[PDB]
Design a protein around this nucleic acid. Structure first.
Ligand SMILES: [K+]
Ligand SMILES: [Mg+2]
Ligand SMILES: [Mg+2]
Ligand SMILES: [Mg+2]
Ligand SMILES: [Mg+2]
Ligand SMILES: [Mg+2]
Ligand SMILES: [Mg+2]
Ligand SMILES: [Mg+2]
Ligand SMILES: [Mg+2]
Ligand SMILES: [Mg+2]
Ligand SMILES: [Mg+2]
Ligand SMILES: [Mg+2]
Ligand SMILES: [Mg+2]
Ligand SMILES: [Mg+2]
Ligand SMILES: [Mg+2]
Ligand SMILES: [Mg+2]
Ligand SMILES: [Mg+2]
Ligand SMILES: [Mg+2]
Ligand SMILES: [Mg+2]
Ligand SMILES: [Mg+2]
Ligand SMILES: [Mg+2]
Ligand SMILES: [Mg+2]
Ligand SMILES: [Mg+2]
Ligand SMILES: [Mg+2]
Ligand SMILES: [Mg+2]
Ligand SMILES: [Mg+2]
Ligand SMILES: [Mg+2]
Ligand SMILES: [Mg+2]
Ligand SMILES: [Mg+2]
Ligand SMILES: [Mg+2]
Ligand SMILES: [Mg+2]
Ligand SMILES: [Mg+2]
Ligand SMILES: [Mg+2]
Ligand SMILES: [Mg+2]
Ligand SMILES: [Mg+2]
Ligand SMILES: [Mg+2]
Ligand SMILES: [Mg+2]
Ligand SMILES: [Mg+2]
Ligand SMILES: [Mg+2]
Ligand SMILES: [Mg+2]
Ligand SMILES: [Mg+2]
Ligand SMILES: [Mg+2]
Ligand SMILES: [Mg+2]
Ligand SMILES: [Mg+2]
Ligand SMILES: [Mg+2]
Ligand SMILES: [Mg+2]
Ligand code: NA
Ligand code: NA
Lengths: 208, 53, 144, 49
RNA sequence: CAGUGAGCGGCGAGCGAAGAGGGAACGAACUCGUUGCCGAAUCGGGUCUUACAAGGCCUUGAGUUGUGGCACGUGUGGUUGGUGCAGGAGUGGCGAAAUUCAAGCGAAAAGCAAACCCGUUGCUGAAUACAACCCUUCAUGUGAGUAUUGAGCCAAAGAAGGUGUUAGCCCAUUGAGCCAUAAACCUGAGCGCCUCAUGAACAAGCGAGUAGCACUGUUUGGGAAUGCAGUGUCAAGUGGCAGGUAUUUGUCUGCCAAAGUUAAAUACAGAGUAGGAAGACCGAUAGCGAACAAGUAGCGUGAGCGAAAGUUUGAAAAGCACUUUGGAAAGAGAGUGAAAUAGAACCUGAAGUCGUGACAAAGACAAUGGAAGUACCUCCAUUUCAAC
RNA sequence: UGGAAAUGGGGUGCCCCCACCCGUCUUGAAACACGGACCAAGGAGUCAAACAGACGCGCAAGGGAGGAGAUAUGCCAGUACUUCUCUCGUACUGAAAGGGAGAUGCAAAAUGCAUCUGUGGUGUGCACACGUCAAAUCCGUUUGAUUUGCCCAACACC
RNA sequence: UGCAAGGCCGGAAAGAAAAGAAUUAGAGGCACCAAGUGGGCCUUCUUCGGUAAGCGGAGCAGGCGAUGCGGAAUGAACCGC
RNA sequence: GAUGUGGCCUGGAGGUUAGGACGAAGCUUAUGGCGUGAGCCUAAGAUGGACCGGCCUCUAGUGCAGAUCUUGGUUGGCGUA
RNA sequence: AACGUGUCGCGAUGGAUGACUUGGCUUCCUAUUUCGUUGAAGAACGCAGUAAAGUGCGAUAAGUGGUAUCAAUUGCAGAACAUUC
RNA sequence: CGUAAAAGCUUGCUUGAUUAACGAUUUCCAGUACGAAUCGAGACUGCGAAAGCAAGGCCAGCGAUCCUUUGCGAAGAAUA
């Protein structure tokens, strides 16, 4: 008999199993720990090779899209030319001192632009630049003692000089206002929703 | 909580005292245990009769 | 483990529990969900009512992120308030502030009796929830 | 003990007077024929015992 | 995300993705055409500078039916070319400790003193052995100590291989360290000289049989048509393309097709070269067809098909000298070896079948089988043998 | 104290009695139904994925990853550690636009008002508490019934 | 202040007498998961078709199938068990 | 046909406890003893020559009398046609 | 009687079992890692004192040259810088 | 099978052969569906002086998914 079971949909009707007549189509993960070890070793070797430069370049802070991830923050691809100009940097020059540049991002508001300019200013304040010729030092380049006293940043996301992404702070406890105690907010929200929901029909009825 | 293992504490025991023999032989239990009664005498070596007539 | 299976118990029985008469053949009733309307109709009708047919309108390119909208009830609000702040909270005084969208909720529903008054910031709210919280002494402020 | 999902699933959902839940992973699949009067027939919600 | 409250489907069987989020990687970006300003400043070939120089000189040879350049006084270049000089990595050789310590042979080169301590001490022997029905006489027999016991050393090395039995100290291996190097690789973009380059002083436009549309065909989850192909038709001008239900008309958002190059994170589902590391896998009818002169021997006109088979004697050939019977093969003696019951494709040597000796008997009930006795036997077990 | 006796096993023959050839399909096999000369080695319910039920274990209105990283870690394909996030669940319903669940009291407002130690009601319902009646009793107490209160889990009707 | 319905309060109750005046190897109810089977045949009483059949088709019950043992010399189903 | 078993047996793994050149595995049996049974243990070898037993967990290519079953060997017919 | 049957001791035929394993299968890693008209892969014929197959090699033919090492190779011949010819 | 001042015959007036908030049930039966049938509540009606009777002609006369096709979401009004 069959009885009461779920109706099955297991999707295994193609030649996926390797047998005496089929090559198969499979993927196993038996090399996962070895690959993890290899990646860590490569990162360590690359850090040794590029010492004393930080292993990861500097990146900006952006807001995630859609209404589901509106409240989250993360790292973007690169800094915008408007932000670089506000901080006082040529993009081509900035590309040579470990700053990522992205010419596509738009900067549609002032808050994100200000936060990115602050990140850039902090990085430039903390930067130490080696001279091309130590016998003839120029402006903006470090001295022999500063060059000797140098360390490497091996953080996963870089940002060892600017910190992690900043989230807005929480509100402190307060007391209810008279307006908040009197007014009904459901009516306000529903009226605003209906104003957009019934815009076309209301306009057409008016045009009569 | 542990400083290394975040939010970990030792599990709570199911029994406060694991010596149940002491509990079973304590005076408090013996006060409420049922009394021991006298039993019938053990059967003798001779076979008992079963024929009424 | 192979040592716990019925094969180990059935070594020597010659039929392995499939009978002498019916026997164990390959596919005695078709493969998969075959015959759902012809010779498996009783099973399909009594255990899976509503398997066949069409219903409703179509939505071609569905995106779930714009539809994201989780809810939380009025009597569950203490899950988002710290113990000390909850202890120091009474009607007429200072109340803790709860931000729903930072905790993963969008709408506030009004089931049950509220335990501790507070100020709730939410995207959506229901009539009963708004009325009950205002009567209890808290407040709701809209956010986006 | 009542109120468990297994208890809610026990029984056949296609007989008159039954309100058990079917075993299905896709919530929108098992509608239509046998659950709406417009699609052939509808399972009766009540039956005298 | 997602076997999806998307979607496709005799809406049956079945099929079936994308944006967002956490991550890997990432010094990641550049070149033509067109427009504007120049107009051979370009390329190839000879010849000379240590030089087929990104160099000088000469060339109608190519090229104006368009190569190429520029915008959208202190320094530098080891990726201009010619000459030289270092260190490192890599590669190849060389390179470590401690007992063949003492006890001798069939039976003490074995034990007991019941957690630990006594114990760097006490006490010994049911092997006067065995060798085929029993008893006397004479013979014959025990391979190699990595075993046992008692003492003693090495360890930054206890790690597995070899050696006639089971080895930290019999042998090999492994560490610090030493020596030698075509080019290439790494090092204030290592460091000098000549030559050569160079940072830095003094406005209009934007890729045409293309995109699109009609018919037909195929493909896709893509549904009044996701991508593509054939034919017909065939554009616009900062206007165009995309916003997952067709049309017309208004807004809004993103982007600018019809030219090109580009590392890493990913594959190696019957590849190859040079090196390595392993396994709760198989153990010679197994594991690759092939542990072996295996894609071999052999088969087929041919395309193709394709085995069986561990040479595993012994520690070491010490591989049976010599006598004798036989034409020979071989037999009977003798000898080597701990064993020949290890004698050559020789470790062990089962089942089935057969020969021989001794014994049990037995009609014709096919034979086999059960239950209960008895006759005869028994290299088997246990018990008893004295007021027991 | 023996080449001993005795009692159990083991072997072969004999007597009286009993007794159709195994495996299989089949209503029915011993059959004039099929497969069956002997021995050795080999020989058949497995692995993966989706779901459900019973049982074991951890946590609990919360449970848990996965991928990846970090350093003990440079012997070690293991173990130890980690954030956001993601997923199942705490709420369902409609084709959809959408909406969204406490109790009591006063009352009857087209979002009524007030309190917050609380099973929405009724019937049947472990244990516990208060009494009573039987039978037995080693006189300390036991074993059964029943009254009343609250009724846990659960069932039925609202 | 009659009938119908849902409740509350109180009483009575050989817990069911006597006349042949029941009995019980008499614990009731409720679920979850799953196998084999879905060719039958025989007999007793009642039968339908057929000349009839060790023939075909049904009703009630008991059996063989799935089961030996003791009897009818021998027999799946008869008698006893 | 279902289920249970401090139920039996085989190859390997994590632990623990033993054995062996004064003779391991394998092989032979009128070698008995134990268990209802699957099986376990001892004796003898006038056999062999180097490994291996018990117990608790883990694991699987884990138990043969027949498939006109596979491979190897043997065999009556037969000193016959 | 003979043939034949049964049990035990010994012996044949046969090649199972056990122990052994320079083989197979499977899983990982490293890099100055990828042939050919400057004639490849594959096919043929030859080469040793003695040499059928196989292995190596090409009329310089079981091999010439260079560096390292340090006394053999071996069935039997044969030869005989060790300062490393 | 049932029926006699009718359930038959004649005649008069009519459209209960309409709608009927997803009420319950019988027959087949797995206590599924389809077909047929029974007891009801609401609207608007017909006949009758009235109590009442009637949502076809009692009991056979009929049909899933997908697809095609028809009918109801009349005009007016909400500061939502
Ligand atoms: K140079
Ligand atoms: Mg069935
Ligand atoms: Mg079964
Ligand atoms: Mg079947
Ligand atoms: Mg619930
Ligand atoms: Mg899911
Ligand atoms: Mg497809
Ligand atoms: Mg130009
Ligand atoms: Mg040009
Ligand atoms: Mg010595
Ligand atoms: Mg060793
Ligand atoms: Mg363009
Ligand atoms: Mg075209
Ligand atoms: Mg297709
Ligand atoms: Mg390309
Ligand atoms: Mg073989
Ligand atoms: Mg083989
Ligand atoms: Mg031997
Ligand atoms: Mg031999
Ligand atoms: Mg034999
Ligand atoms: Mg018989
Ligand atoms: Mg038949
Ligand atoms: Mg038979
Ligand atoms: Mg016959
Ligand atoms: Mg047949
Ligand atoms: Mg969570
Ligand atoms: Mg955060
Ligand atoms: Mg739920
Ligand atoms: Mg919804
Ligand atoms: Mg609706
Ligand atoms: Mg009476
Ligand atoms: Mg059948
Ligand atoms: Mg018949
Ligand atoms: Mg049968
Ligand atoms: Mg009987
Ligand atoms: Mg007779
Ligand atoms: Mg195995
Ligand atoms: Mg025998
Ligand atoms: Mg097998
Ligand atoms: Mg066999
Ligand atoms: Mg030549
Ligand atoms: Mg209904
Ligand atoms: Mg109907
Ligand atoms: Mg009516
Ligand atoms: Mg129809
Ligand atoms: Mg209207
Ligand atoms: Na099946
Ligand atoms: Na040695």
């Amino acid at each position: 008999p069959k009885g009461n079971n779920a109706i099955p949909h297991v999707h295994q009707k193609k030649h996926w199993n390797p047998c005496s007549s089929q090559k198969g189509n499979v993927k196993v993960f038996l090399n996962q720990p070895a690959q993890k070890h290899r990646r860590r070793r490569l990162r360590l070797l690359k850090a040794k090779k590029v010492f004393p430069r930080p292993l990861k370049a500097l990146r900006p802070q952006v807001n995630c899209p859609t209404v589901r991830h509106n409240m989250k923050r993360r790292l973007g691809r690169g800094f915008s030319p408007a932000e670089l100009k506000a901080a006082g940097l040529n993009p081509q020059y900035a590309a040579t001192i470990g700053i990522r540049v992205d010419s596509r991002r738009k900067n549609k508001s002032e808050e994100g632009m200000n936060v990115n300019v602050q990140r850039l200013k902090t990085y430039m304040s903390k930067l130490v630049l080696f001279p091309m010729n130590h016998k003839k030092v120029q402006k903006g380049e470090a001295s022999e003692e500063e060059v000797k006293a140098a360390t490497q940043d091996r953080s996963r996301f870089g940002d060892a000089a600017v910190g992690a992404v900043v989230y807005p702070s929480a509100e402190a406890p307060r007391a209810v206002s008279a307006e908040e105690k009197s007014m009904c907010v459901y009516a306000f929200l529903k009226k605003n929703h209906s104003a957009v929901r019934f815009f076309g029909t209301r306009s057409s009825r008016a045009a009569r | 909580a542990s400083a290394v293992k975040k939010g970990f504490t030792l599990p709570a025991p199911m029994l406060t005292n694991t010596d149940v023999t002491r509990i079973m032989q304590s005076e408090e239990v013996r006060r409420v245990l049922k009394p021991k009664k006298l039993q019938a005498k053990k059967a003798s070596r001779f076979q008992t009769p079963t024929n009424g007539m | 483990p192979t040592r716990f299976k019925k094969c180990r118990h059935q070594r020597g029985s010659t039929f392995c529990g499939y009978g002498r008469v019916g026997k164990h053949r390959k596919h005695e009733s078709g493969r998969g969900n075959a015959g759902g309307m012809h010779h498996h109709r009783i099973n399909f009708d009594k255990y899976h009512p509503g398997y066949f047919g069409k219903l409703g309108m179509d939505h071609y390119h569905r995106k779930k992120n714009p539809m994201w909208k989780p809810t939380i009830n009025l009597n569950n609000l203490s899950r988002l308030i710290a113990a000390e702040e909850a202890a120091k909270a009474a009607k007429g005084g200072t109340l803790p502030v709860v931000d729903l969208q930072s905790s993963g909720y969008a709408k506030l529903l009004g089931n049950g009796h509220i335990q501790v008054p507070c100020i709730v910031k939410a995207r959506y709210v229901s009539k009963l929830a708004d009325k009950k919280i205002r009567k209890a002494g808290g407040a709701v402020v809209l956010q986006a | 003990k009542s109120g468990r999902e297994s208890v809610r699933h026990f029984g056949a959902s296609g007989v008159p007077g039954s309100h058990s839940k079917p075993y299905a992973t896709n919530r929108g699949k098992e509608t239509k024929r046998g659950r709406r009067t417009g699609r052939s027939y509808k399972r009766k919600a009540f039956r005298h015992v």
